[PDB]
Amino acid sequence: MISLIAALAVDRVIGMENAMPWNLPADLAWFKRNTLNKPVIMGRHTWESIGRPCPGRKNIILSSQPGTDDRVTWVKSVDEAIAAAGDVPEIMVIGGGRVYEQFLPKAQKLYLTHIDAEVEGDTHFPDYEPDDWESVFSEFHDADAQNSHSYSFEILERR
Numbered sequence: 001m002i003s004l005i006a007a008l009a010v011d012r013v014i015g016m017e018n019a020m021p022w023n024l025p026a027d028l029a030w031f032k033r034n035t036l037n038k039p040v041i042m043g044r045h046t047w048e049s050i051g052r053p054c055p056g057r058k059n060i061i062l063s064s065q066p067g068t069d070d071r072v073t074w075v076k077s078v079d080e081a082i083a084a085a086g087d088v089p090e091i092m093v094i095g096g097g098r099v100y101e102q103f104l105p106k107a108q109k110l111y112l113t114h115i116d117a118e119v120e121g122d123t124h125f126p127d128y129e130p131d132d133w134e135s136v137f138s139e140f141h142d143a144d145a146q147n148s149h150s151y152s153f154e155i156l157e158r159r
């Protein structure tokens with residue numbers, strides 16, 4: 001299946017000036033745990049903010065232009081992106097804004113981190129209805145030494 005994984009703040013803010021504006025180690029671990037051994041799909045701007053392939057995962061980058069780095073697999077369309085992922089149980093779509101928008105109607109699961117931080121973004125997660133998504137897991141955690149904000153993990157399954 002196709003799954004989306006994303007950290008959101010207030011107003012579903014996901015990013016600002018090509019970066020993510022918070023400090024949350026608990027989220028990185030959760031991300032690593034749910035994506036390791038999976039193919040990961042991302043847009044070119046998200047690729048350019050990471051710059052090294054996500055190790056232990058097949059890396060597929062969407063771009064309308066020819067690839068500029070042979071450590072990763074480049075694809076020119078959403079259908080080419082899914083085909084390059086081959087026959088796996090779960091393909092992870094990991095950002096950014098424009099990529100989430102395109103894959104959201106094809107997705108069966110969402111893994112979300114709701115971070116209780118009020119920041120300004122120039123990129124937002126698509127608007128999603130509970131009419132379509134059932135919550136099968138959610139945990140809330142208070143801020144601590146490593147994590148400056150409270151945050152909750154949730155897994156939703158399409159209805």
Ligand SMILES: NC(=O)c1ccc[n+]([C@@H]2O[C@H](COP(=O)([O-])OP(=O)(O)OC[C@H]3O[C@@H](n4cnc5c(N)ncnc54)[C@H](OP(=O)(O)O)[C@@H]3O)[C@@H](O)[C@H]2O)c1
Pocket residue numbers: 005006007008013014015016017018019020042043044045046047049062063064065075076077078094095096097098099100102123
């Ligand atoms: N909060 C999170 O969990 C999270 C996760 C990841 C990223 N982010 C943030 O999201 C922001 C980047 O988001 P973004 O929406 O600007 O960019 P993005 O979605 O990462 O990348 C957009 C680019 O991807 C390519 N692309 C997307 N769809 C394509 C398609 N269907 N066919 C061909 N190319 C396609 C295009 O590249 P060309 O111009 O080369 O054609 C497009 O300009 C950053 O601030 C990043 O930090 C947040």
Ligand SMILES: CN(Cc1cnc2nc(N)nc(N)c2n1)c1ccc(C(=O)N[C@@H](CCC(=O)O)C(=O)O)cc1
Pocket residue numbers: 005006007020027028029030031032049050054055093094095112113
């Ligand atoms: C820019 N970016 C995208 C990113 C970050 N956190 C996310 N968190 C969630 N929940 N969802 C995402 N899509 C997501 N995406 C990043 C930034 C750093 C690393 C990163 O290097 N993660 C390490 C974890 C260990 C470390 O950060 O040093 C890894 O190897 O997976 C990955 C993606």
Ligand SMILES: [Ca+2]
Pocket residue numbers: 051052
């Ligand atoms: Ca580097």
Ligand SMILES: [Ca+2]
Pocket residue numbers: 158159
């Ligand atoms: Ca059902």
